Design a protein. Structure first.
Length: 344
């Protein structure tokens, strides 16, 4: 690990999307008011519901007094007027591009019938993503001391959007959105930065800490990073510190695939079964992140759990580990599985 940059932020994390490794961090698990990053979870619920066919972008949703722009007087909004009908596509675009508070209530009610129930789906996914430092009480992120997240949990949430909802994630790089004759911009300034390929994700601010932003950027070789900064003093500062994390990341590290799903990488002798050997590999891709330039020098080896393999063997069975070393230290590992059944 070389020198991490000096970052003006209460909390932050930088992480390779593909391998999940944290390249640098400060209080990654410290609890923070998520403010509008809450809308990332809200859009996750909406995007899964669209993906599963439980709602359709063409659903026309009726705006009544609880979704009405008037109830969000000093906060971001898409300007939904009472007694109009609005498509789920517009609503979701409005949550995603301009953090519309009125749009999130409208969606929560359309999907879950009311807001407390919708919020519970948000918390379902909190469990299902494996997060330990997040809890939502709203679909919009209005501050509440029972509502919190962390830099690492928000990195995990943004990876799931990018990974589970590729079609929805595209909306996150739209630069503005017009609705009800009002045009408002995406607030992630990094989308205008031609010198880096930022294509997400979401901004926020809370008087408890400062300004926050979740950004993700790619390289021509498909390296993808995700940064999160929280409690930054200035709203311009948050784009600067983020760009600092990302560029340090792309400057200093690289990511490569060490295993391909389904591929047989090895043959191993088996004792007492229907064949004399068995193919080993992994049923999923695997990726590691190393200092840039160092791919040549990485060395893989096995650690079967047992000395030799004895039948019966089940396809998919984990019988050991591939261990990756660089310059004499073990940097990264991954399961090794049996690829075909061996009975008897």
């Amino acid at each position: 690990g070389v020198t991490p940059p000096q970052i003006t932020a209460q909390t932050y994390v930088l992480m390779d999307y593909n391998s999940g490794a944290i390249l640098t961090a400060l209080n990654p698990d410290q609890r923070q008011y998520p403010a509008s990053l809450t809308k990332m979870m809200t859009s996750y619920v909406v995007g899964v519901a669209l993906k599963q066919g439980k709602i359709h972008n063409t659903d026309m949703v009726t705006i009544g007094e609880s979704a009405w722009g008037r109830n969000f007087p000093d906060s971001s909004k898409m300007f939904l007027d009472l007694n109009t009908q609005v498509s789920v596509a517009d609503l979701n675009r409005g949550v995603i591009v301009v953090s519309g508070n009125d749009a999130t209530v409208a969606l929560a009610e359309h999907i879950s019938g009311n807001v407390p129930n919708f919020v519970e789906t948000m918390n379902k996914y909190v469990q299902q993503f494996g997060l330990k430092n997040t809890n939502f009480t709203t679909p919009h992120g209005l501050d509440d001391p029972n509502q919190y997240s962390s830099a690492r949990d928000m990195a995990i949430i943004g990876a799931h959007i990018i990974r589970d909802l590729p079609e929805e994630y595209k909306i996150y790089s739209e630069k503005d959105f017009t609705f009800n004759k009002i045009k408002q911009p995406n607030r992630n300034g990094l989308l205008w930065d031609k010198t880096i390929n930022v294509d997400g994700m979401k901004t926020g601010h809370t008087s408890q800490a400062g300004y926050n932003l979740v950004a993700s950027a790619t390289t021509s070789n498909n390296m993808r990073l995700i940064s999160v900064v929280m409690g930054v003093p200035t709203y311009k500062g948050r784009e600067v510190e983020s760009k600092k994390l990302l560029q340090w990341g792309f400057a200093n590290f690289e990511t490569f695939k060490t295993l391909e799903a389904g591929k047989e990488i090895s043959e191993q002798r088996v004792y007492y079964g229907d064949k004399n050997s068995v193919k080993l590999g992994a049923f999923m891709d695997h990726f590691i992140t190393i200092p840039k330039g160092k791919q040549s020098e990485v060395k893989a080896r096995y650690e079967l759990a047992d000395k030799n393999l004895q039948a019966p063997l089940a396809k998919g069975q984990v019988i050991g580990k591939v261990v990756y070393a660089l310059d004499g230290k073990d940097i990264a590992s991954a399961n090794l599985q049996v690829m075909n059944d061996v009975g008897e």
